[PDB]
Amino acid sequence: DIQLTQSPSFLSASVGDRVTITCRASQDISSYVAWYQQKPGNAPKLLISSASSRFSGSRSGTDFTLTISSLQPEDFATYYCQQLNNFGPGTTVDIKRTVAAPSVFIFPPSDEQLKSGTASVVCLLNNFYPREAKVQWKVDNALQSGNSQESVTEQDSKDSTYSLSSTLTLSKADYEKHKVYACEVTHQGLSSPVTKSFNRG
Amino acid sequence: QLQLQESGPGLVKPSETLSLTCSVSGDAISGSNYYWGWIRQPPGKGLQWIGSIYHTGSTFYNPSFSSRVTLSVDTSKNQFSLKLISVNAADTAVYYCARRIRGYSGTYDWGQGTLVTVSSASTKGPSVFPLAPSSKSTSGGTAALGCLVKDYFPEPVTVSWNSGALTSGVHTFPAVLQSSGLYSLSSVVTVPSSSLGTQTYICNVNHKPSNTKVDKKVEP
């Protein structure tokens, strides 16, 4: 069989940009190619086939091209080319947008979870851009390490922002030691770090 | 309306056999000119074609699978099946059933996909805790609230808010594997501050491997 390769492998472009993606076959078996769009959490879906308006296909040398004439926020996806039972490795298209500062929210652990012997404190960074952000947990003004885990959403299909959870997980005993739980956030959209805090009381 | 629907276990022990079935509606396998196939997508990776079957029962396989794959078709039930023996962790993936019409220009129709995790770990249902809205989670006229879905195995869980009526501003984070070997995630949503008194906010959590169904009301 053959191998299909794609270029670029990854790219970030602004809303309204023209974007062109290339599919190259190791051997010329067919004049037909198809393209699939896979949005996050979804199966791939057929976009266009050269055998059948923002999306269009062409030839460049022996390569096949897919052009998005004006990139939209909902085009955030991985695009795959296909010939017979062969797929390319995919080209991921991210959206570049203007800087957006996060909104920061903090959530103490629930009484039910405390009854369980474990305490999760959740800090939410909502609807920001770019993806880079620094979240620091401070507990009674001491900086914490090794007890937090971060999760990031995929880029939003409508506003192209990210959201971020940082979850501090302690034993109930370790939670009960200290009083002030603070999430301190540094991000390009903020002049100075933003701290959200609560008292265990 | 063509629909390709995967079914089968979402967790398979190492060295055991992975089995899935595709139920086809909206078209007939019998007498068709399609290849009926399975394609998988391991976490963080691209698409890998596994094998295909014709309505006659003739099969074609990816040599990568080293003859570990068997496809079969039941034209009476309008279904076709995947069997993958001697699985290991490299076989953890989303499995899609799919179809492609014969010929050089044929394209794929896809099912929705089903996650199969290869692990010796046992199934465990999640605990669901509120992320309560408060003054500490209100920015302007906007309040954030959510649900913490903690300590389950294997993936996935699904989270809806108010039976699907609340979709705007919902963020359900990718699960994180904890040191314990169990998954955890939060789902959050932003709502008007003024609505908290009148509107009841419920996160609907489903973890099918443990038959866990939780509707947790999240109060201020």
Author numbering:
A (entry chain L): 1 to 52, 60 to 91, 96 to 212
B (entry chain H): 1 to 35, 35A, 35B, 36 to 82, 82A, 82B, 82C, 83 to 100, ...
Paper text:
Model building was facilitated by high-resolution crystal structures of unbound Fabs (1-103: 1.9 Å, 1-32: 2.1 Å, 2-18: 2.8 Å, and 2-25: 2.5 Å), which were then used as reference restraints and lightly refined as a part of the complex. The Fab 1-103 epitope is solely composed of residues from the membrane-distal tip of UL128, sometimes referred to as site 1 of IR1 (16, 38). The heavy chain complementarity-determining region 3 (CDRH3) and light chain complementarity-determining region 1 (CDRL1) of Fab 1-103 compete with NRP2 for binding to the same portion of Pentamer that is engaged by the calcium-coordinating loop (residues 251 to 258) of NRP2 domain a2. Given that higher concentrations of antibody are typically required to inhibit adhered virions compared to free virions, it is expected that 1-103 and 1-32 exhibited substantially weaker neutralization potencies in this post-attachment assay. Consistent with the results of our post-attachment assay, 2-18 and 2-25 had a minimal effect on the interaction between NRP2 and Pentamer, whereas receptor binding was clearly disrupted in the presence of 1-103 and 1-32. The data reported here show that antibodies such as 1-103 and 2-18 neutralize with different mechanisms, although they are directed against the same IR.
The HCMV Pentamer, composed of gH, gL, UL128, UL130, and UL131A, enhances entry into epithelial, endothelial, and myeloid cells by interacting with the cell surface receptor neuropilin 2 (NRP2). The other critical tropism-determining complex is the HCMV Pentamer, which is composed of glycoproteins UL128, UL130, and UL131A and the same gH and gL proteins that comprise the bulk of the HCMV Trimer. This elongated heteropentamer mediates tropism for endothelial and epithelial cells by binding to neuropilin 2 (NRP2) and triggering the viral fusion protein, gB, to facilitate entry into host cells. HCMV-directed antibodies isolated from asymptomatic donors predominantly target the Pentamer, suggesting that Pentamer-specific antibodies may restrict viral dissemination, making Pentamer a target for the development of vaccines and immunotherapeutics.
